[PDB]
Amino acid sequence: MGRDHTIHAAVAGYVKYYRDPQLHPDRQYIGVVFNRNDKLPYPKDAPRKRKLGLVA
Amino acid sequence: ATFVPRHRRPYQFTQLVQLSDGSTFTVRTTMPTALYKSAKDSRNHLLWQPSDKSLK
Amino acid sequence: SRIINVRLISMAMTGYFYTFTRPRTSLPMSMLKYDPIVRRKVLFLEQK
Amino acid sequence: FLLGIKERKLAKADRREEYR
Amino acid sequence: IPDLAELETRSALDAPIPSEEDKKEFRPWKRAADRKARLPSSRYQYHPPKYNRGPLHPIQSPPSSDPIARDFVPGPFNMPRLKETFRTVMASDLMTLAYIHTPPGTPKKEPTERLRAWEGDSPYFANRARRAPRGAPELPIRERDISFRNIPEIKEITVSTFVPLGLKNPDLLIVARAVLLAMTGTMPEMTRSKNNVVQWQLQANKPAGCKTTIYGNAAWEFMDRLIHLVLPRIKDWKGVPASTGDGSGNVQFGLNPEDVQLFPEVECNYDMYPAKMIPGCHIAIKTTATSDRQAKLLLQSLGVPFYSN
Amino acid sequence: FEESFYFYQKRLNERLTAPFRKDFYFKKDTAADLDWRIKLKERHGVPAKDIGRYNPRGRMAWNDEVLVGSQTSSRKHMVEKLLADAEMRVSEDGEEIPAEDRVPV
Amino acid sequence: IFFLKGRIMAGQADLTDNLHDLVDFKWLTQEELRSTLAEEYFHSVKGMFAER
Amino acid sequence: GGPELGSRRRRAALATTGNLPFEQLPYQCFQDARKILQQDRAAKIAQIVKETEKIKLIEARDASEFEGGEAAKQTRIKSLRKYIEELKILADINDPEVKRRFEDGRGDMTKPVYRFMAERRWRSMDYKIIAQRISQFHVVPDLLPAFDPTMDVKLSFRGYQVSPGAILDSRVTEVAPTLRMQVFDKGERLLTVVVIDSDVPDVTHDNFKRRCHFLAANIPWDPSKTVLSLRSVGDRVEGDVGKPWLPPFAQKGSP
Amino acid sequence: DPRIINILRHFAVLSPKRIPPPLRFGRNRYLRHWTIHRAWLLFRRQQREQRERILMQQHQSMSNACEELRNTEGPGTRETGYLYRVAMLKNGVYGLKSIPIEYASRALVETPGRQAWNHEWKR
Amino acid sequence: SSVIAELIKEKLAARAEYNARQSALRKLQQQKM
RNA sequence: UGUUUGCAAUUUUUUAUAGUAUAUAUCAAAUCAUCUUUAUGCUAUUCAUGGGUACAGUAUAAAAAUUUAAGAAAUUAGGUAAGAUUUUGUUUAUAGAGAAAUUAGAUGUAAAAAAAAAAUCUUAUGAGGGCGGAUCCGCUUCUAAUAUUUUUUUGUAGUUAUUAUUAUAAUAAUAAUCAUGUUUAUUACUUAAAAAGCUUAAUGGCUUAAUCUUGCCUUACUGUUUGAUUAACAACAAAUCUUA
Numbered sequence A: 001m002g003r004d005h006t007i008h009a010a011v012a013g014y015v016k017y018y019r020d021p022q023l024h025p026d027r028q029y030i031g032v033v034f035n036r037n038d039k040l041p042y043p044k045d046a047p048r049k050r051k052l053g054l055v056a
Numbered sequence B: 001a002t003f004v005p006r007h008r009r010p011y012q013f014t015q016l017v018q019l020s021d022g023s024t025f026t027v028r029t030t031m032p033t034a035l036y037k038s039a040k041d042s043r044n045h046l047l048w049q050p051s052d053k054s055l056k
Numbered sequence C: 001s002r003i004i005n006v007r008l009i010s011m012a013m014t015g016y017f018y019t020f021t022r023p024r025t026s027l028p029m030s031m032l033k034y035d036p037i038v039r040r041k042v043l044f045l046e047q048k
Numbered sequence D: 001f002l003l004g005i006k007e008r009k010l011a012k013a014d015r016r017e018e019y020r
Numbered sequence E: 001i002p003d004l005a006e007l008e009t010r011s012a013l014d015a016p017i018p019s020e021e022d023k024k025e026f027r028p029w030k031r032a033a034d035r036k037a038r039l040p041s042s043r044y045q046y047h048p049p050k051y052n053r054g055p056l057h058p059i060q061s062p063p064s065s066d067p068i069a070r071d072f073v074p075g076p077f078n079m080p081r082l083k084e085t086f087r088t089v090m091a092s093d094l095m096t097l098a099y100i101h102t103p104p105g106t107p108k109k110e111p112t113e114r115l116r117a118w119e120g121d122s123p124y125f126a127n128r129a130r131r132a133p134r135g136a137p138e139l140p141i142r143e144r145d146i147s148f149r150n151i152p153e154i155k156e157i158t159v160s161t162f163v164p165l166g167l168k169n170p171d172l173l174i175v176a177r178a179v180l181l182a183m184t185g186t187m188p189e190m191t192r193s194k195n196n197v198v199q200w201q202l203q204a205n206k207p208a209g210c211k212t213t214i215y216g217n218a219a220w221e222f223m224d225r226l227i228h229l230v231l232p233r234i235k236d237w238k239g240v241p242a243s244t245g246d247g248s249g250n251v252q253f254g255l256n257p258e259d260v261q262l263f264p265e266v267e268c269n270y271d272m273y274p275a276k277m278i279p280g281c282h283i284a285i286k287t288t289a290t291s292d293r294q295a296k297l298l299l300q301s302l303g304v305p306f307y308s309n
Numbered sequence F: 001f002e003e004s005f006y007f008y009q010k011r012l013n014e015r016l017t018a019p020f021r022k023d024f025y026f027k028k029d030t031a032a033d034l035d036w037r038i039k040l041k042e043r044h045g046v047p048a049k050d051i052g053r054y055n056p057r058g059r060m061a062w063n064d065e066v067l068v069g070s071q072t073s074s075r076k077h078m079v080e081k082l083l084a085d086a087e088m089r090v091s092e093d094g095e096e097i098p099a100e101d102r103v104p105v
Numbered sequence G: 001i002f003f004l005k006g007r008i009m010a011g012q013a014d015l016t017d018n019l020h021d022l023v024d025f026k027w028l029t030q031e032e033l034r035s036t037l038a039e040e041y042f043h044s045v046k047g048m049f050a051e052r
Numbered sequence H: 001g002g003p004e005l006g007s008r009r010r011r012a013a014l015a016t017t018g019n020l021p022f023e024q025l026p027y028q029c030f031q032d033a034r035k036i037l038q039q040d041r042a043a044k045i046a047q048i049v050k051e052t053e054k055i056k057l058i059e060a061r062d063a064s065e066f067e068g069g070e071a072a073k074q075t076r077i078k079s080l081r082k083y084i085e086e087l088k089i090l091a092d093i094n095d096p097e098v099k100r101r102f103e104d105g106r107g108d109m110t111k112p113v114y115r116f117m118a119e120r121r122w123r124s125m126d127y128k129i130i131a132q133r134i135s136q137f138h139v140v141p142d143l144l145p146a147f148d149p150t151m152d153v154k155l156s157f158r159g160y161q162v163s164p165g166a167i168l169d170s171r172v173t174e175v176a177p178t179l180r181m182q183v184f185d186k187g188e189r190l191l192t193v194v195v196i197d198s199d200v201p202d203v204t205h206d207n208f209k210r211r212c213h214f215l216a217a218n219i220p221w222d223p224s225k226t227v228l229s230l231r232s233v234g235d236r237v238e239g240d241v242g243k244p245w246l247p248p249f250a251q252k253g254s255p
Numbered sequence I: 001d002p003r004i005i006n007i008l009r010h011f012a013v014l015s016p017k018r019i020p021p022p023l024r025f026g027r028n029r030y031l032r033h034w035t036i037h038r039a040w041l042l043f044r045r046q047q048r049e050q051r052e053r054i055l056m057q058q059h060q061s062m063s064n065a066c067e068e069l070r071n072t073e074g075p076g077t078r079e080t081g082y083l084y085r086v087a088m089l090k091n092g093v094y095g096l097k098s099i100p101i102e103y104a105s106r107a108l109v110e111t112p113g114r115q116a117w118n119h120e121w122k123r
Numbered sequence J: 001s002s003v004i005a006e007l008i009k010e011k012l013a014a015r016a017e018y019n020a021r022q023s024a025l026r027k028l029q030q031q032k033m
Numbered sequence K: 001u002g003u004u005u006g007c008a009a010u011u012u013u014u015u016a017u018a019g020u021a022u023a024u025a026u027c028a029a030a031u032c033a034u035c036u037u038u039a040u041g042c043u044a045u046u047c048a049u050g051g052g053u054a055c056a057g058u059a060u061a062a063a064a065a066u067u068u069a070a071g072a073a074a075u076u077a078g079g080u081a082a083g084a085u086u087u088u089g090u091u092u093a094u095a096g097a098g099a100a101a102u103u104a105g106a107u108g109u110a111a112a113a114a115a116a117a118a119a120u121c122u123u124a125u126g127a128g129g130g131c132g133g134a135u136c137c138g139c140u141u142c143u144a145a146u147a148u149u150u151u152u153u154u155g156u157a158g159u160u161a162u163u164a165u166u167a168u169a170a171u172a173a174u175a176a177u178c179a180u181g182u183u184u185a186u187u188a189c190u191u192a193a194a195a196a197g198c199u200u201a202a203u204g205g206c207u208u209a210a211u212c213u214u215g216c217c218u219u220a221c222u223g224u225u226u227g228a229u230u231a232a233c234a235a236c237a238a239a240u241c242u243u244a
């Protein structure tokens, strides 16, 4: 989130509009998933899905 | 960093309060007097002793 | 007229400066800023 | 400071002994 | 027994009471004098921090109970006669006076939701905001029955003094601050005006009074001085109005300036305050009661006469 | 335990409460002031009458805990000292009343 | 028998010209009370007792 | 008056004062407060004998008698057994010497009392920081679905204690670390130590893989043992080393 | 003005800089205070548990009598539980004259008065 | 103050030793600067 | 000799010793300005300005102090850390006090403790599962975790007291039960909407912080640079956000 509340992607991926009742009961969030078939919000107990993002 | 305020209390004494009936009890007060002889009190007021005829 | 633009001159005598605004009915400005000539944080003081 | 008063007070006592 | 074996065998609480001979040779005043030296200091030199940065800061503050702590207040010094009197005798009566017998197998009452929701067949009712409090804008607290587990008691007392004229004569606030100092035994906190009125010359956000709050035994002792030494001496006093009460178990009333000097703490030094600078105070007695009638009943149990307002 | 505890806490109050200003209760050079000063000298400067002899300040302030059997912490000793103070020791002229001509309370 | 509880502000009990056939009266503590009254009569009225 | 007696204040105060136990100091309030706790510990020990003999009666009782069978008999002895443990801790939690012995490190950790205070010390600060390191560094849910630590673990490299979550040098972390573990539970159990590196970069599949840098098992540990050196896991102490200590390393460029 | 200065001198003493500092106890003194603290809190428990035990017993006695009273009948041609329903009424309990001022006003005192009790009181 | 003097001497020596070391190293820093 | 005078009590570090990496002591720093004359004076008494005497735990003559409220005022707005979380209005009551002045209030619940059976999905960097083409992709069984069921149940004690039976104890029922803790308890969840506050109108947002309070600060930094504003304003330029 920027200064004026503008939301930007931090990673390459696909935009996903969802609601996280575990995080906040009455908020709606925007995310970015590395796999288009994934669904948010990710279960709090699942391992974090992250990409290396480096070249050798 | 919330400040921890220190209590500012004045010197206190232990005073004997002798009511108009002669009964004496101990109290914690700030006055320097040792014995407070009370000539007038609830034990010598008609409003608190409506049935008493001596005060009537 | 109420606000003036002052110049905070470096005290490393490197000639770098910072310009900030402040009201006339106030005290002179004085800050610890980064001088890019010597590449170190030095004391900057108002010009006059 | 405190010990200084001790030496000065003790010194004053020696002057007083001679007076007495 | 194996359970007893797990206990600390070197128990110090089971040691014999000290003897008399050893008691005679224990003279803390002689030990220091004979040494003629300063004992080395201990390496444990932890002192309570002046500021609590947070729960994970390396240096933490101790609980207020600890004597070294900067919030420590010496414990009780005596038993207030009014706190003893109420609990020993009065308490059994209030429980007896106000009692409603519940059958043996009465089902527990389920408290109703005071913020109602919309239930019905209209598709709009699902996501409607919870309804407002029915009646008053703010929800009033529900009364608790007087049982052996809930006996109304006095908790704290707040004495508040408002001195509008102080703004112009700053010496009215200094004297006012001193009166509440000796009357209650605490350091009053100055208060500021909040409204602006040109007719009354009242200006907003300026120091125009002080207040104090005494808790625990200090509150009980304050009631003793009020009910038995101050209030009986007021001339032509009728009693506490029967309309007093905020609807939650708190009683409030006001004293006149000539009755504030009747306090035993104020009269002894009545000549130390400049003339006609003694203020009037508002005394708010906060109790554990949950209703106005339960509070008035409590005060009646402590010898407080009420008059029909 | 209650008696010992109160005495223990009363002495702790000496080390944490503000000092007593006699000027706030007695006017200088009066019967009350002079009478308070004489009795204050008998108490060795302690403005209180139920805590014995203890100085919150000084090199010997640490010794605030009485030994076993201390009559000072008893209630009979408190009432005795407090009643030995209510008697006036100075007449209205500022002269110390003789010890034999003092009226007990 | 249902026993109510009463508080006496002042005065003394007088058995003169009593309607009920009462002979003597005495004010006893909780300790002396159990010795005078019967066991069953005492076991029923001991729940009303107080600390002191 | 050597260093084996304590600090300079003790060695100094132990030669200018009298020889008398701390519990026997002739102080009014201290001896009047020790008499209240005295008859209390006697009342708690008198309760442990009444609850102990009450279990035998319930133990030697046919399950058929209980209206709930054998299930209602184990839940009644469960609450009784737990009620005894609290009485054993409440019998010495007020002792002034037990507090002194535990603070001086000379307390026996095989007794419930000392383990109760030792656990109340760990939770006060040490648990809080490690509970924070687990969340902030994303140990959970990365490694485990949910984890609430129950024992203390402090690792030191070459004597110097390293704080939790501290970037260490590749030379300092070249030898097996020493674990200063304190267990607050009763009995002796086997503890398995696994050091896993969860940030090994795999450039082929564009993701991270997990690499185990140390693995050991079958390590007997009691609440009286404090230090464990990961070097002598199979030489001095009993244990099975699945994989010896691998020097941590991190290639240039990767976080 | 001189009287006001006397007032200020009282507040100047209560200033945070003038008041005494936080206590500084050694280990032996601190441990001794810990026992005094520990015992006092336990002593309150015993007074609390004792005060709460008596309050519980009294309530049970009232409930027993009330529950029993509800089942009884009479006197004479009165329906069962009439007396129970009459006892639960709270007429004047929350009024102004509910509890007599004299009984409540009298409190416990360390020592008795000149006349501890008045037997000459007449209706 | 028979045995305490011996202990105080160990205290004074330790303080004096460090005070000498502090001055023996502060002089070194003033040479590198 | 900083740190409370009766004795290994906080964290890290320095040094030393024993020791084969641990252990104790020691040192420094952080946390905190606790006040420190061992008596030299005072007090009482006595004896000729003076000389003694006093014997101290019920401590003492032997140190109660020895050479003008900022926590009553300032509406100070940014970085960062911590703490607090309805502050507005309305309403109730409250000496002076009135339509209009201050203060105190204004939701409810929980805190001994569960175990166990199957089912419905969903997930898993779980079994490197199996089969097609360890990790990719499509199929997939098993375990695990979350969610859900009103599901299938079992247990719901112990402690204090009461009552009932039984021979102070046992059993059953009933009521209470967050409490080893300075009751001003504490901690967690909950408490419609509007309103207050956030440099200024209006709109949206924030109460889990963007508000408020406090501590230390001045990144309101220098150079270059990324991706966007469905390719800013339907061009260009001046602009806005953002990355390294």
Ligand SMILES: NC(=O)c1ccc[n+]([C@@H]2O[C@H](COP(=O)([O-])OP(=O)(O)OC[C@H]3O[C@@H](n4cnc5c(N)ncnc54)[C@H](O)[C@@H]3O)[C@@H](O)[C@H]2O)c1
Pocket: E076, E077, E078, E079, E080, E216, E217, I044, I048, I052, K179, K181, K183, K185
């Ligand atoms: N505070 C707790 O630890 C605690 C624990 C369980 C229950 N409760 C409940 O809280 C309510 C009040 O607690 P409480 O019973 O401890 O009240 P309390 O009377 O014992 O304590 C209240 C205040 O009075 C003081 N006090 C108590 N006894 C005293 C005495 N003998 N002499 C002088 N001062 C004394 C205390 O220091 C405290 O400040 C009760 O209903 C009780 O059941 C409290």
Ligand SMILES: [K+]
Pocket: none
């Ligand atoms: K700030």
Ligand SMILES: [K+]
Pocket: K086
């Ligand atoms: K609201």
Ligand SMILES: [Mg+2]
Pocket: K077, K198
């Ligand atoms: Mg802001």
Ligand SMILES: [Mg+2]
Pocket: none
């Ligand atoms: Mg408001």
Ligand SMILES: [Mg+2]
Pocket: K231
């Ligand atoms: Mg365009």
